Amino acid sequence: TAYIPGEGHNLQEHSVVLIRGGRVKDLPGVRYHIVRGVYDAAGVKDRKKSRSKYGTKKPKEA
Amino acid sequence: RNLSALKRHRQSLKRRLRNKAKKSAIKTLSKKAIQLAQEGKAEEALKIMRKAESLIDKAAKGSTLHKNAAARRKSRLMRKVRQLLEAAGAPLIGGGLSA
Amino acid sequence: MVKIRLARFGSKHNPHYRIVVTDARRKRDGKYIEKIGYYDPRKTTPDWLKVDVERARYWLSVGAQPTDTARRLLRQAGVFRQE
Amino acid sequence: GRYIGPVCRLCRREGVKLYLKGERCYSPKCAMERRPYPPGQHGQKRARRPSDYAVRLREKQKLRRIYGISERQFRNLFEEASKKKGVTGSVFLGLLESRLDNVVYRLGFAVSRRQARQLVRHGHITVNGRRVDLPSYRVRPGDEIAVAEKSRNLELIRQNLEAMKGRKVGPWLSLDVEGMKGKFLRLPDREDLALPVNEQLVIEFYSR
Amino acid sequence: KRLRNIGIAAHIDAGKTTTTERILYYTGRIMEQERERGITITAAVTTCFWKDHRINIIDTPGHVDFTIEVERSMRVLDGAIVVFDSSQGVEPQSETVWRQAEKYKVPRIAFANKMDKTGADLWLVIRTMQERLGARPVVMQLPIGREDTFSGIIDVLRMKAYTYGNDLGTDIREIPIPEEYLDQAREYHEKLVEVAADFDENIMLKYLEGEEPTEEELVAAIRKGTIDLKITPVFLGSALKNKGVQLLLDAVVDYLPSPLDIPPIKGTTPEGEVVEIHPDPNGPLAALAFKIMADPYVGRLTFIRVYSGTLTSGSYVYNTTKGRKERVARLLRMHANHREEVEELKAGDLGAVVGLKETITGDTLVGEDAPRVILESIEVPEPVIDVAIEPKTKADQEKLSQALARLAEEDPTFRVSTHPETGQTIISGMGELHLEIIVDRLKREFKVDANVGKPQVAYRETITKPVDVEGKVKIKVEPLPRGSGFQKGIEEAMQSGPLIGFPVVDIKVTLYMAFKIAGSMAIKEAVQKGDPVILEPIMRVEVTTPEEYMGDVIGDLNARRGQILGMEPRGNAQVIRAFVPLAEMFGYATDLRSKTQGRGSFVMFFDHYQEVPKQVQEKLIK
RNA sequence: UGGAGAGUUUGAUCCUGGCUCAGGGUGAACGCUGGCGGCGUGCCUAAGACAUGCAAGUCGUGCGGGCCGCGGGGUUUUACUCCGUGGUCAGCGGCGGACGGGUGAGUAACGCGUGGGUGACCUACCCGGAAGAGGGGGACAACCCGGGGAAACUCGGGCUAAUCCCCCAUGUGGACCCGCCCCUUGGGGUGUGUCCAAAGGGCUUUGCCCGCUUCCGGAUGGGCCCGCGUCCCAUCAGCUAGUUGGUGGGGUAAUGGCCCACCAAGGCGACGACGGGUAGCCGGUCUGAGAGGAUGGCCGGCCACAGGGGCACUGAGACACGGGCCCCACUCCUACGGGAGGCAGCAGUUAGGAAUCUUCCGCAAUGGGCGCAAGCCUGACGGAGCGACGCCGCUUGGAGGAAGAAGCCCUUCGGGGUGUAAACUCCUGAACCCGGGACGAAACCCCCGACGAGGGGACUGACGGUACCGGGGUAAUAGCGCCGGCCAACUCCGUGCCAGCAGCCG
Ligand SMILES: Nc1nc2c(ncn2[C@@H]2O[C@H](COP(=O)(O)OP(=O)(O)CP(=O)(O)O)[C@@H](O)[C@H]2O)c(=O)[nH]1
Ligand SMILES: [Mg+2]
Ligand SMILES: [Mg+2]
Ligand SMILES: [Mg+2]
Ligand SMILES: [Mg+2]
Ligand SMILES: [Mg+2]
Ligand SMILES: [Mg+2]
Ligand SMILES: [Mg+2]
Ligand SMILES: [Mg+2]
Ligand SMILES: [Mg+2]
Ligand SMILES: [Mg+2]
Ligand SMILES: [Mg+2]
Ligand SMILES: [Mg+2]
Ligand SMILES: [Mg+2]
Ligand SMILES: [Mg+2]
Ligand SMILES: [Mg+2]
């Protein structure tokens, strides 16, 4: 099992995923994170601060 | 497809027969001599040894034997000839080996 | 046979050779018997060709062949001139 | 590198007047005079007493900001000082101060160290006759540091060498305002520079 | 440009692959389920030279299932040849390839092929060409023998005629027209000239005056008309039996456009403004990848058309369409028998590249350092049928999906998706025959064996009478209008219904850890006492059909448990709107195609849920 | 010239003690972002499978032929195609293909490291020295002929040349038995007996150049041996039949149970035999105050391997990476008769993977092979390309510019912050464009001298119209992480054990 970080996500039953390592002091037996922004894991929408975790492209300042 | 290391192969095969010939000859004669030395037939034992010696040395000339190898072959032949004879003996055909 | 030849050192666009004696069969940049000179084909410094003549002569006398390019450089430091 | 971006804003924060604009950071203006407090929404609040870390961070940052040098270049420069012979603190300054961009400022061919960088970098400076455009260039005892013959009469250079008639150039140096030549005589003694920097705390910064 | 890029497109089994195969032979004088199933499925470009003229040919498949292979050649090629089973006329998939040629503005000739077969009649083709697809055909030649004795071809225009002795194209050679046909010949020259009149005016005038114009200026006047897409020269022959093919090739070099004779295509710069791409070999590079192939022996092969510039082998280029830097590692030309590696590929030219890892069809390539323009590409189209796929034994699960990803990359009419409710992998294509060759491609090509089957449906449940209850606290539960909507304990037993276990919906709960367990046991009960009913997705469907078929189409919709909603025209045909349960809509596209002789289409969009016909449910508690 | 600690068990305390963090590092990978250059560096996984090209040849001054382009006239010339030379083609014969290049699978071992030993040995080409190169024969390809084949090509019969083979001679010398002297493991000498050599080619030719033979010495490279050093499990404690030793053989360059007969019953093991697991080893590298710990990609040295396994042949050397045989695995062509194949060479494809490049340029340099030489070959190599992968360097302006615009944030509604930051004035001038333009290349060769030394001449550049110099010349990319404590950096809003954060405390 693997944590899906970020507010909101788009993972479903055959979504392909990049696993990362890093556990979560809180979910037992979750030793891994999903790398947002890669394969079928979308970035995190509206994210503006820690954007490179959370795989979020730099938003346009039109 | 083709390299002419094929040549080197064609050639190895010729030499392989050439040396086979000289080598098997050297053993038939070396054997023959020790055999005769044991029967006590010293004129012909020494007679043959000389032939064997010649052929071994002849072989040292090119790739077939070389070196300490021929010398060794020779050494063991006359060590083995001289002694078998010596048990009966007298070195009749004074040829071949030192007084 | 054994050779007197240029081993490449220095760096990219910075050739600096060592004049070295070595079995012919080593790789060019490999182990070598003895160092005798060094050579910098671009003369970026005044001491750009050096050779230990009295050693090169030892090596020539025991049958080391020099490279064309090496010969040229030993000649130039008078390994070959005999008075 | 060289930062690029607001300066007499760390002329502040370090809380102590570096000289990043040369000429203005002398007017009733280096903001040290006006707003001698840190930038930002806070800055004029209760100062919380500094951690031992912050003490040194700041001291390190102070020195670095003075010369306009990247932290990678700085640490390198420093680690070199440490390996080098005798007092790491003093030596390290001497290496900072041996820099070309800074030598040029100490000669007053340029007003600010930023400026000196830009001058060096644009071919206007020459060391021992050949032209150098590497701010990081290390200047050695005995070097002639001049202004390029083609640059000799530029608006900025005459202004700046006009102000050098009058002034004394730091003891470890010589200057020839008429002919625009300078000589790096020896390495700067720890006292020759009145630096607002306890360099011993900078050594200690790099000890962690 | 001394260079002709031409597709061969036609109904199924009209003879394109054979035609092509003969073109490469004449121009030569100095494939798995395609076997099994007997069809063309993948087309490749191929070069040959006719009269010091470079001909690039794409032999296209006929089936709807592979429309994508036309929707593709019809882009990147400049001119088409449209074949006909002249014993059959214009068939429904001729109509299709035609309207595709229409939308890319593709100058074209026709080829009444199979003039040898029992029934084969040019006039069938001609009439039907005009009756069924609105075209203006122009008789450029005539035959010598009603079907069985079709022995030679009159060329009107040049007044000349050829007869073939064998069915081998090894004893051809000119003859004069015979006495008969000679009255028939004329009558077209003049009648071509009648038509050419509208193009040259020097012919217009020269017509009126009873003066037959010059051979070259007619050709130019015809050709001009072909390229303005107002005239469709018709040629005839038998590809099988080597009759009219050389003539056909001549006719390609006479009337079919060289890249200069067609508007150059358009693109969209990063700024945003449209712009034409000058077709200069020394301009920047712009180019369109239109096919990926996984080929041993060179690996991934990417076929491209160069519009502007000179694509030079051993460079880097930029896929503007997906912004990756790609490498042309070598460039390639497919001849009839071998593949020429070439150093470059200039404007107007097609080839294949190796290198190139990300680029797919429609994707645009430009120079390494060039104006990142994005070219008008290729056009979806959209899949009509879909099925659950799962492997017979899992572990093969990975092989299966890795493949479908490969395959959805080669061909973008094939999609893979995952039903969001029950996570089964849903595969979709352009027909039964499509999906069959895909599955039959997973076994042979990818060593993965799968089952296929109807997607199971997203059911719902609700109640049908209001209710009051005690959960041990009390609640009232009424229904609501179809499609309405809807404490934390109750939304939680809303998951599983009583009947099948799908979500409960469209109800109002009125209340009048500990709290949680009580709502959950209350509503769980309310739904039973409320006396429920299964709801099931209903799709709004609009199908499009020539009016011929309406009755039978509608009848079958009613037969699918539907409810028709109305019917308007859209252009030359007629639309029918209706609601039908998703369930009964399985394999609709291929039933529809049987009822409309492949002329119908349809689309489908979720609309609402609604209760069932009291037959299922029991037959659904199962 | 060298050494920092902090959070967390308690109501609180001290101690114990684990967990956790700050640092450095990497062949990296992934995310956001990305401007330049230099030097490095880039399949860590499937020692999986590989389309295609190239990676080892060269000598006509070893030899005889086929074909071609010429010169010079044969019947005057095309039909009998004749001499001379300059090309090409295989063949025969040499030297090279044992080096260079790849990889880390196996190997826990004299494999490696380190120091030694060989009276127990070898070393092609190179050098020094001595003495020869004198007689004769012969065959196999090429070539022609035929049978065979779809072809690959394959068999048979016959011709033939040489630096190919063979015999004979001379024996400077060498080998061998035996005896003698010295020496001391088989080292040096000596006597008689026996046994052993050789090849010619080219020129301007009674002289030069290249080769051939024997011996001695040198140099270089090797083989074999020994001391010591070389990971985890003892929940592996006993191991061993060529096993330990002897004798006599065989084998090899050479010692040796290396192999074989015979005899004896040994040999090894808690100082860890045997077994199982892991691993190529080192110079170094990373870390560390050090001692240590970890590692062994790149570069150098040694070893091993070349689809898996065995085997030998040729040879100075191989049990042979682009040589051979067989077995096995796998693939390819096929006319169904049979054939062919081995990227862990450079590129590249495909698969596996989080992930790793051009099917690039050039032999100008350095090095290698062959050649008298000219020169040929050289994916060694020198370069270019791609990748922020790494390190170093450089830019995105500089100086002026308000008690301080606007916007945006805070606000105790006076202000405060962004901020000299901008706007604005001057100044400079990355990129660009123009002109010029390298070093790296002087040898080999040629001429004088003697084809020595020494003097003189000629050719030669992939990178590259590149670096760099000169002249013009534009204000010209900035982003990423963090701001509860460790830890440098705080306010407002939204949110309300939800959404979410999280390395630990939380
Ligand atoms: N009598 C006759 N038959 C022909 C002729 N050309 C093709 N055919 C027949 O139709 C078959 C059509 O095969 P093909 O030529 O591949 O047609 P196609 O249209 O390419 C098939 P798809 O559309 O599936 O690719 C031929 O084998 C033959 O059976 C023709 O000239 N004369
Ligand atoms: Mg955060
Ligand atoms: Mg016998
Ligand atoms: Mg049909
Ligand atoms: Mg077809
Ligand atoms: Mg069919
Ligand atoms: Mg306790
Ligand atoms: Mg990017
Ligand atoms: Mg040892
Ligand atoms: Mg023995
Ligand atoms: Mg041997
Ligand atoms: Mg291993
Ligand atoms: Mg320590
Ligand atoms: Mg392999
Ligand atoms: Mg190979
Ligand atoms: Mg993959």
Three-class DSSP labels, E6-44? EEEEECCCCCHHHHHHHHHHHCCCCCCHHHHHCCCCCCC
Name the 3-class secondary structure at C2.
strand
Q: Are E49 and E73 in contact (CB under 8 A)?
A: no
Total domains in chain B come to 1
For residue E326, the surrounding DSSP H or E stretch is: strand E324-334
Q: Is the CB of E331 under 7 A from strand F?
A: no
CA–CA separation, E95 and E79 (whole Å): 17
Per-residue tokens: E572: 């030359």
Task: Output the CA–CA distances (angstroms, integers) from residue D115 to D98, D105, D184, in the order listed.
Answer: 17, 8, 19
Q: Write out D112-127 in H/E/C secondary structure.
A: CHHHHHHHHHCCCEEE
Is E564 exposed, middle or buried (CB count within 10 Å of its CB: 0-12, 13-18, 19+)? middle
In angstroms, what separates the C-alpha of A15 from chain E's closest C-alpha?
9
Nucleic strand F contacts from chain B, 49-88, CB < 7 Å: 49-50, 53-54, 56-58, 60-72, 74-80, 82
Q: Which amino acid is at E384?
A: V
Beta-bridge partners for E332: E341, E352
CA of C24 to C1' of F124 (A): 13
Using CB atoms, list chains with 3+ pairs below 8 Å to chain A: E
Residues 6+ apart with CB under 8 A from B60: B66, B67, B69, B70
User: Other CB atoms closer than 10 Å to residue D13's CB: what's the count?
Assistant: 16
Total domains in chain C come to 1
Domain boundaries, chain D: 1-96+194-208, 97-193
Strands C34-39 and E425-429, by their bridges, are unpaired
Please name the fold of domain D97-193. 3.10.290
Residue E447: alpha-carbon gap to chain centroid: 28
Q: Is the CB of C50 under 7 A from strand F?
A: no
Q: Which residue of A lies nearest to E423 if distances are taken between CA atoms?
A: A13
Residues 6+ apart with CB under 8 A from E198: E204, E225, E230
Nearest atom (ligand 1) to Cα of E39: 24
The backbone torsions φ and ψ at residue E429, rounded to the nearest 5 degrees and listed phi first, read -155, -165
CA–CA separation, E71 and D40 (whole Å): 61
CA–CA separation, D128 and D132 (whole Å): 10
Residues 6+ apart with CB under 8 A from A16: A39, A40
For residue A56, the surrounding DSSP H or E stretch is: none
User: Other CB atoms closer than 10 Å to residue E483's CB: what's the count?
Assistant: 12
Which residue has a Cα nearest atom 6 of ligand 1? E15
The answer, for A14 touching chain E at a CB cutoff of 8 Å, is yes
Per-residue tokens: E244: 């009219």
In angstroms, what separates the C-alpha of A13 from chain E's closest C-alpha?
5
Radius of gyration of chain D (CA): 18
Task: Output the CA–CA distances (angstroms, integers) from residue E225 to D61, D112, E255, in the order listed.
Answer: 79, 76, 9
CA–CA separation, C24 and C67 (whole Å): 10
- Residue ranges making up the domain that contains B78: 1-99
Task: Output the CA–CA distances (angstroms, integers) from residue D46 to D33, D37, E67, E225, E384, in the order listed.
Answer: 20, 11, 75, 88, 71
CA nearest E197: which of E208, E188, E187?
E208
Q: Are E246 and E172 in contact (CB under 8 A)?
A: yes
Which nucleotide has its C1' atom closest to residue C41's CA?
Answer: F440
CA–CA separation, E405 and E309 (whole Å): 33
HSE-CB for B16 with a 13 A CA cutoff:
7
Residues 6+ apart with CB under 8 A from E522: E469, E470, E471, E473, E474, E475, E490
Domain holding C65: CATH number? Answer: 3.30.1320.10
CA–CA separation, E212 and E409 (whole Å): 56
Ligand 1 pocket: which of E8, E17, E87, E91 to mutate (most atoms within 8 A of CB): E17
CA nearest E81: which of E25, E124, E127, E23?
E23
Residues 6+ apart with CB under 8 A from C5: C19, C20, C21, C22, C66, C67, C69, C70
Nearest atom (ligand 1) to Cα of E59: 20
A/E interface, count of CB pairs below 8 Å = 10
CA nearest E521: which of E499, E489, E496?
E489
CA nearest D62: which of D173, D169, D202, D206?
D202
Four-residue CA torsion sign, E446, E448, E451, E455: negative
Beta carbon of E56 within 6 Å of any ligand 1 atom: no
CA–CA separation, D36 and D48 (whole Å): 17
Q: Which residues of C36-62 are buried (b: 16+ CB within 10 A; e: fewer)?
A: bbbbbeeeeeeeebebbeebbeebbee
- Residue ranges making up the domain that contains C56: 1-83
Give the sheet arrangement for strand E161-163, strand by strand. E141-144, E152-155, E161-163, E174-175
DSSP code per residue over E220-276: HHHHHHHHTTS-EEEEE-BTTTTBSHHHHHHHHHHHSPPGGGS---EEE-SSS-EEE
Domain holding B45: CATH number? Answer: 1.20.58.110
Residue E198: alpha-carbon gap to chain centroid: 34
Instruction: Determine if residue E13 is labeled as part of a ligand binding site.
Output: yes
Per-residue tokens: B20: 């086979």
CA–CA separation, B32 and B45 (whole Å): 8
Per-residue tokens: C81: 């001139």
DSSP code per residue over E142-199: EEESSGGG--EEEESSS--EEE-SSSSSSS--EE---STTTTTSSTTTTTHHHHHTTT
Which nucleotide has its C1' atom closest to residue C12's CA?
Answer: F39
CA nearest E195: which of E247, E232, E248, E153?
E232
Four-residue CA torsion sign, D84, D88, D92, D94: negative
Q: Are D127 and D139 in contact (CB under 8 A)?
A: yes
Q: Are A45 and A14 in contact (CB under 8 A)?
A: no
Residues 6+ apart with CB under 8 A from C2: C21, C22, C23, C24, C33, C59, C62, C63, C64, C65
Resolution attained, angstroms: 2.9
Q: Are E109 and E235 in contact (CB under 8 A)?
A: yes
User: Other CB atoms closer than 10 Å to residue E121's CB: what's the count?
Assistant: 18
DSSP 8-state class, residue E213: -
Beta-bridge partners for E603: E542
The backbone torsions φ and ψ at residue E591, rounded to the nearest 5 degrees and listed phi first, read -70, -50
Q: Are E237 and E125 in contact (CB under 8 A)?
A: no
What's domain D1-96+194-208's architecture? Orthogonal Bundle (1.10)
Per-residue tokens: A57: 């492209």
The single residue listed with the structure tokens 């280096």 is: D30
Strands E174-175 and E161-163, by their bridges, are antiparallel
The answer, for A13 touching chain E at a CB cutoff of 8 Å, is yes
Name the 3-class secondary structure at D4.
coil
Q: What experiment produced this structure?
A: X-ray
For residue E317, the surrounding DSSP H or E stretch is: strand E315-319
Per-residue tokens: E611: 């209760």
Long-range pairs, C27-34, Cβ under 8 A, ≥24 = C32/C7, C33/C2, C34/C59
The single residue listed with the structure tokens 């997705």 is: E537
Q: Are E527 and E463 in contact (CB under 8 A)?
A: yes
The answer, for E417 touching chain A at a CB cutoff of 8 Å, is no
CA–CA separation, D86 and E57 (whole Å): 82
Q: Write out E502-562 in H/E/C secondary structure.
A: CCECCCEEEECCHHHHHHHHHHHHHHHHCCEEEEEEEEEEEEEECHHHHHHHHHHHHHCCC
CA–CA separation, E88 and E132 (whole Å): 13
First to last CA, chain A: 40
CA–CA separation, E286 and E291 (whole Å): 16
Q: Are C21 and C30 in contact (CB under 8 A)?
A: no
Q: Are E260 and E274 in contact (CB under 8 A)?
A: no
Q: Which residues of E424-458 are buried (b: 16+ CB within 10 A; e: fewer)?
A: bbebbbbbbbbbebbbebbeeebebebeeeebebb
Beta-bridge partners for E460: E535
